[PDB]
Amino acid sequence: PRKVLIISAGASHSVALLSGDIVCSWGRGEDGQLGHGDAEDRPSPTQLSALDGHQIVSVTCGADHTVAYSQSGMEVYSWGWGDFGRLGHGNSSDLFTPLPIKALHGIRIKQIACGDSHCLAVTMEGEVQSWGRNQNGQLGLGDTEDSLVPQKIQAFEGIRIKMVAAGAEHTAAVTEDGDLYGWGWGRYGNLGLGDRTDRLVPERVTSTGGEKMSMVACGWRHTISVSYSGALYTYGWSKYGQLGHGDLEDHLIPHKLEALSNSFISQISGGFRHTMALTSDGKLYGWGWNKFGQVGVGNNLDQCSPVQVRFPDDQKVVQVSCGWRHTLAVTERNNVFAWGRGTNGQLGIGESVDRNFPKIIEALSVDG
Amino acid sequence: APPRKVLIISAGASHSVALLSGDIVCSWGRGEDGQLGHGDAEDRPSPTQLSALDGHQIVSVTCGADHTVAYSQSGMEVYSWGWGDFGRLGHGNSSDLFTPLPIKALHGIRIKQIACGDSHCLAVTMEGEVQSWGRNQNGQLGLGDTEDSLVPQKIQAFEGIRIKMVAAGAEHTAAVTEDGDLYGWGWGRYGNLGLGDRTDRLVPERVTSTGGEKMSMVACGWRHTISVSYSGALYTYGWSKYGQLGHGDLEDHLIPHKLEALSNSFISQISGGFRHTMALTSDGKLYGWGWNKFGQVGVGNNLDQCSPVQVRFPDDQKVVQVSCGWRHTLAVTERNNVFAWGRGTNGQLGIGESVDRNFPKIIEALSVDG
Numbered sequence: 122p123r124k125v126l127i128i129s130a131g132a133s134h135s136v137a138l139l140s141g142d143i144v145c146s147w148g149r150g151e152d153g154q155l156g157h158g159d160a161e162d163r164p165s166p167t168q169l170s171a172l173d174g175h176q177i178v179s180v181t182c183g184a185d186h187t188v189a190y191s192q193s194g195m196e197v198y199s200w201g202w203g204d205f206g207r208l209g210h211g212n213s214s215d216l217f218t219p220l221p222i223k224a225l226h227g228i229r230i231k232q233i234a235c236g237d238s239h240c241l242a243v244t245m246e247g248e249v250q251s252w253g254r255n256q257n258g259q260l261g262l263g264d265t266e267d268s269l270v271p272q273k274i275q276a277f278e279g280i281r282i283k284m285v286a287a288g289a290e291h292t293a294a295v296t297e298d299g300d301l302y303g304w305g306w307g308r309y310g311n312l313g314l315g316d317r318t319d320r321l322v323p324e325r326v327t328s329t330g331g332e333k334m335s336m337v338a339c340g341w342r343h344t345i346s347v348s349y350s351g352a353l354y355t356y357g358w359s360k361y362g363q364l365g366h367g368d369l370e371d372h373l374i375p376h377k378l379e380a381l382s383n384s385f386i387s388q389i390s391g392g393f394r395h396t397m398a399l400t401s402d403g404k405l406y407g408w409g410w411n412k413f414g415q416v417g418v419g420n421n422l423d424q425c426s427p428v429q430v431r432f433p434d435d436q437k438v439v440q441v442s443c444g445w446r447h448t449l450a451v452t453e454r455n456n457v458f459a460w461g462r463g464t465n466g467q468l469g470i471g472e473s474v475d476r477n478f479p480k481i482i483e484a485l486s487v488d489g
Numbered sequence: 490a491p492p493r494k495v496l497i498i499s500a501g502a503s504h505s506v507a508l509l510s511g512d513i514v515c516s517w518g519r520g521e522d523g524q525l526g527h528g529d530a531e532d533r534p535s536p537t538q539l540s541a542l543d544g545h546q547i548v549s550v551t552c553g554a555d556h557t558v559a560y561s562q563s564g565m566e567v568y569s570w571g572w573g574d575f576g577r578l579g580h581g582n583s584s585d586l587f588t589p590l591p592i593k594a595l596h597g598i599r600i601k602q603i604a605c606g607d608s609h610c611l612a613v614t615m616e617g618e619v620q621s622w623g624r625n626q627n628g629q630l631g632l633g634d635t636e637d638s639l640v641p642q643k644i645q646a647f648e649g650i651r652i653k654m655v656a657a658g659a660e661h662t663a664a665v666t667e668d669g670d671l672y673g674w675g676w677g678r679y680g681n682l683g684l685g686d687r688t689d690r691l692v693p694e695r696v697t698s699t700g701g702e703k704m705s706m707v708a709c710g711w712r713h714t715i716s717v718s719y720s721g722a723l724y725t726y727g728w729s730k731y732g733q734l735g736h737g738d739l740e741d742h743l744i745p746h747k748l749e750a751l752s753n754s755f756i757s758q759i760s761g762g763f764r765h766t767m768a769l770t771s772d773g774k775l776y777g778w779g780w781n782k783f784g785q786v787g788v789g790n791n792l793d794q795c796s797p798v799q800v801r802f803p804d805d806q807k808v809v810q811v812s813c814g815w816r817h818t819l820a821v822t823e824r825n826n827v828f829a830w831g832r833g834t835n836g837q838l839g840i841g842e843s844v845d846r847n848f849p850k851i852i853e854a855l856s857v858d859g
Contacts, residue, residue, distance in 0.1 A: 160782070162834070256627065256676075267678065308636075462521075464521065464530075464532070
């Protein structure tokens with residue numbers, strides 16, 4: 122088989138980066154998110170030939186679109202649903218095949234994150250450009266006007282940015298010195314600012330306890346951050362227990378998930394109404410909404426606190442990404458697994474009903 | 490025996506809903522968020538009776554993007570189901586419903602019409618007042634602010650003003666009064682409010698251009714709006730990236746703009762979809778225009794249409810009813826036949842498993858003919 126480097130799940134689709142700089146995609150294709158030129162669903166992983174030879178180094182999905190970028194090509198590509206300018210091409214057009222974001226050509230890209238209808242990019246210098254829907258200030262540009270092209274977040278002048286993340290309509294960031302910012306839609310307290318108001322510019326979280334943050338990720342209406350100590354924090358919406366605090370209450374400021382204090386967190390991912398966190402010792406913990414089985418624990422009970430996601434022969438997990446109603450994961454033996462809702466083909470195991478525990482994707486896996 | 494006849498059809502993002510004689514509600518298409526109301530999450534590619542409403546005396550059904558509402562004149566009850574986020578369901582919580590539940594706030598209220606957009610709804614009472622609930626981030630509820638409402642609330646701006654009907658797009662709303670004034674509010678960035686600018690309104694504001702011409706009806710697509718004047722002239726405004734305003738170009742209009750190509754005809758019904766438009770003439774002729782990628786304009790191809798083209802039906806039967814979804818269209822004829830066209834991946838076409846269809850196809854389960 123071929124070695125899987127990067128995985129990303131969208132609301133209803135999944136995307137992978139293989140060695141060879143090869144992109145493949147599967148799931149719902151109705152909005153063009155798969156990049157294949159047609160609008161049909163794919164129930165099994167499908168190579169995105171248009172990107173062969175472009176030296177893609179990364180891929181990330183928003184809700185109904187996909188972004189990818191190349192270091193050597195110094196290029197960023199986007200395809201999928203076009204409304205609100207989320208693709209960054211200066212028009213609203215849908216794209217059924219990848220296109221370069223001209224604004225981003227030749228810029229040193231450190232990371233891209235995609236939300237429902239907006240994206241951001243962080244440069245090596247630690248600058249942030251954003252584009253797409255901005256009705257609730259989620260671009261962080263001081264206004265409520267949508268932007269069809271990338272614009273610089275001037276509020277970060279003099280503040281170097283490590284990482285950013287994007288939920289449905291809010292955005293979060295961590296600075297190089299470990300500060301946490303949030304802006305955009307905040308009605309569920311998901312900005313971490315201790316209230317339920319929007320921000321049109323980045324605003325600092327001043328409620329850590331002194332804890333500096335190394336990473337951040339968003340689900341739909343909740344946020345997750347990790348400290349330099351490997352401690353996990355969550356905030357925002359907890360109707361479905363996706364904050365994982367053993368209960369169902371909203372948190373307006375970052376809240377440490379003690380249940381996981383005995384481990385060091387390497388990776389985090391937020392989905393629609395659930396959450397995933399991967400420890401340094403290769404154990405995967407999921408929580409939240411489990412109607413479609415997306416938590417992966419072999420049942421369909423919601424989980425208000427972290428619960429270990431089991432794999433065959435206890436193989437260690439090296440990566441995870443949450444869609445809206447599914448989850449994806451890579452293991453040390455280079456197998457790729459998926460679980461949850463399967464109606465759009467997003468599991469990538471061909472024809473399938475929903476799966477409440479992890480299932481191997483033979484096309485990407487060594488094993489069967 | 491005789492089929493039941495469709496009394497009412499409505500189309501949502503990717504599902505279809507009908508009311509049949511006998512007060513029977515059925516639905517088909519996408520089921521993932523519970524919009525079908527059968528208590529499960531699977532798509533139905535064929536019409537399926539919503540058993541839970543059997544015996545409830547439903548007189549009308551209306552779809553939003555991924556939700557559905559119905560009501561009962563005699564029982565004086567309004568029911569809703571599907572995606573619950575932002576309170577679009579009206580139950581005072583944000584929980585999804587895979588099965589119809591009564592909107593307790595509307596119990597005992599005489600209901601004249603329901604309109605559903607993406608994540609908001611509005612109801613007009615027989616007395617011609619208007620209540621609304623759901624997402625309100627752009628003031629689409631007309632309540633004065635931008636905070637979502639989990640329960641219906643009365644639009645206070647309409648006191649002293651009787652409402653005939655209302656309409657709702659993705660995040661905007663329009664209404665016409667019992668004497669023909671036209672209003673708009675909510676998300677206004679593409680001019681779809683018809684007020685001459687690209688700014689939201691948090692309360693109903695009267696359209697003053699086309700003010701001289703009165704309006705009998707209004708309908709909304711995603712980001713565009715359609716109205717019919719008392720002389721039967723068709724006006725459109727808002728987004729026309731896909732030619733959905735139908736003016737033979739792709740320009741936006743920030744105020745009502747008359748569609749000349751149809752000046753000769755008298756328009757009796759209108760419908761707005763995701764990126765397409767439908768208009769039914771007084772003599773039973775159906776015209777469609779706009780985005781046609783999945784064949785939803787219904788004119789036998791997949792090329793976009795910036796001007797109105799007549800949709801053709803077997804025997805040139807007359808059409809009496811039409812509803813636009815995002816990527817499909819439904820219509821009822823004078824002969825009691827029901828046709829669907831466009832995208833059918835989620836089963837929204839109602840014709841069993843099928844490829845997409847770019848001209849009308851009869852729905853056998855709800856039709857006289859075949």
